[PDB]
């Protein structure tokens, strides 16, 4: 599923991401935009052999099991395929764990490089929330 900008903002808020660990809704939508272009089915292979899955490109190195990432962990305790569902619940629950792990949203390199410090409020401008 490819979410609309405001559609995704609304889904994220409903699932408790708005201001979660102090990260305003705009931060999450910005991250999703640059990680996946709002596409729940997005995947990308990393140089180390791990794979990133879903709207927030959660990595199989640490967070989900894809059965093809040697020596990895599955800390969200979910198959990576669950991170590609049209329903964002699994991705949101797992992101809550990631953002809580000490480094906040810096875990998402694109967020650090493209969203951090920017006018992220613009990502939710005009949205009925
Ligand atoms: Cl899709
Ligand atoms: Cl957009
Ligand atoms: Cl915001
Ligand atoms: Cl892939
Ligand atoms: Cl992989
Ligand atoms: Cl994701
Ligand atoms: Cl594995
Ligand atoms: Cl594990
Ligand atoms: Cl933080
Ligand atoms: Na905070
Ligand atoms: Na894909
Ligand atoms: Na894994």
**SS3 of 44-110:** EECCCCCEEECCCCEECCCCCECCCCCCCCCCCCCEHHHHHCCCCHHHHHHHHHHHCCCCHHHHCHH
Residue 22's Cβ-count burial label (10 Å; 0-12, 13-18, 19+) is: exposed
Length of the chain: 129
Ion ligand 2: protein residues whose beta carbon lies under 5 Å = 5
Q: H-helix or E-strand containing 31?
A: helix 25-36
* Cα 84 to middle of ligand 6, angstroms: 7
Cα dihedral sign, 43-7-82-77: positive
CATH number for the domain spanning 42: value is 1.10.530.10
Domain count, the chain: 1
* Planar angle of CA 27, 43, 83, nearest 5 degrees: 70
Q: H-helix or E-strand containing 43?
A: strand 43-45
Which residues, listed in sequence order, are joined to residue 59 by a DSSP beta bridge? Answer: 52
Question: Residue 112 — φ and ψ, nearest 5°?
Answer: -60, -45
Query: Method used for this model?
Result: X-ray
Q: Resolution of the coordinates in A?
A: 1.9
d(CA 120, CA 36): 17
CB atoms within 10 A of CB 73: 13
* Cα 91 to middle of ligand 9, angstroms: 19
Please indicate whether residue 35 is annotated as part of the active site.
yes
The catalytically annotated residue of 7, 18, 52, 87 is: 52
Please indicate whether residue 7 is annotated as part of the active site.
no
* Cα 74 to middle of ligand 3, angstroms: 30
Which residues have a Cβ under 8 Å from the Cβ of 8 and sit 6 or more positions away?
Answer: 29, 32, 38, 55, 88
Q: Is 18 annotated as a binding residue?
A: no
Which residues, listed in sequence order, are joined to residue 39 by a DSSP beta bridge? Answer: 2
d(CA 25, CA 15): 11
d(CA 23, CA 8): 16
For residue 63, the Cα-to-chain-centroid distance in whole angstroms is 12
Ion ligand 5: protein residues whose beta carbon lies under 5 Å = 50-51, 60, 66, 68-69
Residue 103 sits in which domain range? Answer: 1-129
């Amino acid at each position: 599923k490819v979410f609309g900008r405001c559609e995704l903002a609304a889904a994220m808020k409903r699932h408790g991401l708005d201001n979660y660990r102090g990260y305003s809704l705009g931060n999450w939508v910005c991250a999703a935009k640059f990680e996946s272009n709002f596409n729940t089915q997005a995947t990308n292979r990393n140089t180390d052999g791990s794979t990133d899955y879903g709207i927030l490109q959660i990595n199989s190195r640490w967070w989900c099991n894809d059965g093809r990432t040697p020596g990895s962990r599955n800390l969200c305790n979910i198959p990576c395929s669950a991170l590609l569902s049209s329903d964002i619940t699994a991705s949101v629950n797992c992101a809550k764990k990631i953002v809580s792990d000490g480094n906040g949203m810096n875990a998402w390199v694109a967020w650090r490089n493209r969203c951090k410090g920017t006018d992220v409020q613009a990502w939710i401008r005009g949205c009925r929330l």
